[PDB]
């Protein structure tokens, strides 16, 4: 039937409806820090999130997305390995059933408790739907979460999850500042990849930050209470909604730092 993360519809089954699942620029991947090439021609990232406008939070049945108004150049990413302006459309998370897993990307095979993805679309393509059809259509910022101290700027998100427990539910979610979710340093790794969920289009330029942010146990605990199912259905907790590392194949991971 339709894809998810269970035994019967899990990532190992995805190729059957999305042949691109077995492609050349599949995501995520394991980041080998010894093999990653420091590229000194890489420019510093540019994050301008001061005019960000969140609108809504939604449970789509695979994660929760916080959506932004992308009608104009309000929250954009540029620089780094990018040419042009990329507009933030949404952000979402991937997390585990336990603290030892949940991240999609891995560092020297190390898994984090969760991974945040900030989704941006290349403005030269005019809409998100046209952007995903392009090799350089999207820029996704990947941020690792480790369990430690609470992240203050994540609390507003945590607190609204009770209201979007099941699939299809959504809530009003304005005045959220995405700046609260950034690590102090913007050192990153970059490589060419794809969407980590179906349709798995090979249209992304991943930007993975070296520095993880800490969240508390209690913060991640709230994630784990969400449901994959819609209301009035047998409860299936929303956990382990992460795709395993894929073959790097013919790709090189570049580093912005030594």
Catalytic residue flag (residue 15): no
Smallest distance, Zn ion to C-beta of residue 122, A: 18
Backbone CA torsion sign across 188, 189, 190, 193: negative
- DSSP letters for 13-48: TGGGT-GGGGSSS-S--EE-TTTSEE-TTPPPEEEE
| Active-site choice (1, 13, 62, 92) | 62
Q: Give whichever of 70 and 115 is closer to Zn ion, judged by the CB atom.
A: 115
Within 10 A of 184 (CB to CB), how many other CB atoms are there?
Answer: 6
Q: Using CB positions, name the residue nearest to Zn ion.
A: 117
36 neighbors 75 (Cβ within 8 angstroms): no
Q: Give whichever of 10 and 124 is closer to Zn ion, judged by the CB atom.
A: 10
Tokens read off for 40? 């000194």
Q: Give whichever of 126 and 137 is closer to Zn ion, judged by the CB atom.
A: 137
Smallest distance, Zn ion to C-beta of residue 147, A: 20
Residue ranges that bind Zn ion, judged by CB under 5 A: 117, 196
Is the omega angle on the peptide bond into residue 193 within 30 degrees of 0, that is, cis?
Answer: no
- DSSP letters for 137-167: -EEEEEEEEEESS--GGGHHHHHTGGGG-ST
Within 10 A of 1 (CB to CB), how many other CB atoms are there?
Answer: 7
36 neighbors 254 (Cβ within 8 angstroms): yes
Smallest distance, Zn ion to C-beta of residue 34, A: 26
Q: Give whichever of 87 and 117 is closer to Zn ion, judged by the CB atom.
A: 117
Smallest distance, Zn ion to C-beta of residue 144, A: 13
Smallest distance, Zn ion to C-beta of residue 25, A: 16
For strands 254-255 and 188-193, give the pairing: antiparallel
Tokens read off for 139? 């820029």
What residues are labeled active site? 62
């Amino acid at each position: 039937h339709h894809w998810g993360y269970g035994k019967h519809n899990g990532p190992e089954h995805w190729h059957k409806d999305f042949p691109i699942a077995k492609g050349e620029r599949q995501s995520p991947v394991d980041i080998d820090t010894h093999t990653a090439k420091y590229d000194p021609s890489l420019k510093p990232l540019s994050v301008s999130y001061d005019q960000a406008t969140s609108l809504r939070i939604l449970n789509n049945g695979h994660a929760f997305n916080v959506e932004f108004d992308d009608s104009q150049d309000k929250a954009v990413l540029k620089g780094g390995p990018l040419d042009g302006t990329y507009r933030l459309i949404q952000f979402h998370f991937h997390w585990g059933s336990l603290d030892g897993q949940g991240s999609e990307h891995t560092v020297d095979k190390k898994k984090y408790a969760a991974e945040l993805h900030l989704v941006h679309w290349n403005t030269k393509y005019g809409d998100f739907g046209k952007a995903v059809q392009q090799p350089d259509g999207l820029a996704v910022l990947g941020i690792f979460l480790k369990v430690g101290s609470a992240k203050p700027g994540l609390q507003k998100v945590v607190d609204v999850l009770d209201s979007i427990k099941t699939k299809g539910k959504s809530a009003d979610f304005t005045n959220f500042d995405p700046r609260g979710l950034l690590p102090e340093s913007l050192d990153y790794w970059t490589y060419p990849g794809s969407l980590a969920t179906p349709p798995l289009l090979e249209c992304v330029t991943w930007i993975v930050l070296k520095e993880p942010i800490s969240v508390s146990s209690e913060q991640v605990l709230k994630f784990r209470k969400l449901n994959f199912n819609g209301e009035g259905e047998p409860e299936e907790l929303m956990v382990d909604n992460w795709r395993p590392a894929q073959p790097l194949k013919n790709r090189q991971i570049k580093a912005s730092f030594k």
